[PDB]
């Protein structure tokens with residue numbers, strides 16, 4: 001029942017209810033002739049919504065806000081981008097123009113600036129050291145260490161036992177490394193273990209791209225990352 005890339009035309013966004021007060025949002029983008037899905041999260045924050053990640057671009061993110069307005073009907077007041085890439089910050093300007101307070105760690109903001117990407121307005125303190133966690137309303141933000149990127153954050157919704165891994169966690173169907181241009185391959189397995197150690201009770205694990213699963217996604221990602229690490233030249 002989870003929306004797949006073939007079921008979402010580019011420019012459209014689907015919402016998927018994971019648990020009470022927790023949705024993922026699913027959008028698509030074309031890249032090199034293939035179409036990829038991308039996930040973010042929406043978490044009910046009292047009578048407001050906390051958004052995790054843009055929908056990968058300005059058009060998709062406008063569609064995301066319209067879909068939230070139609071389906072949930074609560075204001076998006078804050079958004080957190082979990083790393084500096086365009087599937088996470090692309091659309092920040094759309095969110096900002098709609099009155100959403102946009103947040104990212106100083107690490108993400110610095111890297112987004114270097115990359116020429118959109119830059120969330122607010123800085124999330126307290127996440128600069130591997131293993132750092134901070135509360136952000138109905139979620140915990142966790143910096144597990146460098147993995148898919150040096151700044152990647154994961155997001156845990158304690159009320160729903162939902163772990164949003166972002167692009168540091170691969171879906172099961174991905175059996176070879178994705179975009180690792182900004183990755184810390186040497187640290188990625190250790191960073192994943194930090195996620196496992198902090199959230200062993202997680203019941204739903206949402207990858208940055210593709211189908212949700214359980215904590216099995218963590219060891220799966222480690223296996224794929226290690227296989228890529230050992231690629232023979």
Ligand SMILES: C[C@H](CS)C(=O)N1CCC[C@@H]1C(=O)O
Nearest residue numbers: 031036085086087167178179
């Ligand atoms: C824009 C995102 C950032 S994780 C990205 O690098 N991806 C995911 C796979 C396809 C696309 C790319 O390779 O550009």
Ligand SMILES: [Zn+2]
Nearest residue numbers: 083085148167
């Ligand atoms: Zn990325």
Ligand SMILES: [Zn+2]
Nearest residue numbers: 085087167208
């Ligand atoms: Zn990604």
Ligand SMILES: [Zn+2]
Nearest residue numbers: 172220221223
């Ligand atoms: Zn696997």
